[PDB]
């Protein structure tokens, strides 16, 4: 394989991964991030992945080792480790498909990661239901 539309395999898999991070999105999503869905005009899916990929980088780099998401139990420690891994995979694949270099994320106020991930699942599914025809 080689001739095709990079979107059916790499992206459908990137969708199930986007839903995997939606499992623990209540205690770790209480950390305001940037809202990249306030002004979408000429931005396509690839541009929205490189931007959301930069914000996803700060999520797995800083919160990956923050007592905030940790909690105070040994069980939440093993579960948290699984969240950081699923993130690394979506940080290289989400924008890896975009094929971009710099992505100055900046037009956005302090939104809550709860509504951010919410719009991430809605955009991935709704727009990928027509990726292939």
From Swiss-Prot:
Please give the annotated consequence of changing residue 13 to A: About 500-fold lower interaction with IL4R than WT
Q: Which UniProt keywords apply?
A: B-cell activation, Cytokine, Disulfide bond, Glycoprotein, Growth factor, Secreted, Signal
Q: Which disease is it linked to?
A: Ischemic stroke: A stroke is an acute neurologic event leading to death of neural tissue of the brain and resulting in loss of motor, sensory and/or cognitive function. Ischemic strokes, resulting from vascular occlusion, is considered to be a highly complex disease consisting of a group of heterogeneous disorders with multiple genetic and environmental risk factors.
What is the recorded name of this protein?
Answer: Interleukin-4
Identify the domain of life: Eukaryota
UniProt entry tagged with the keyword Secreted: yes
Protein source organism: Homo sapiens
GO molecular function terms noted in the UniProt entry: cytokine activity; growth factor activity; interleukin-4 receptor binding
Lineage per the UniProt record: Eukaryota, Metazoa, Chordata, Craniata, Vertebrata
Which residues have a glycan attached per UniProt? 42
Q: Which gene encodes it?
A: IL4
Q: Which residues of the full protein are shown?
A: 25 to 153 of 153
Q: Say which family it is in.
A: Belongs to the IL-4/IL-13 family.
**Where does it reside?**
Secreted
List cellular component terms (GO): extracellular region; extracellular space
Q: How does it assemble?
A: Interacts with IL4R. Interacts with IL13RA1.
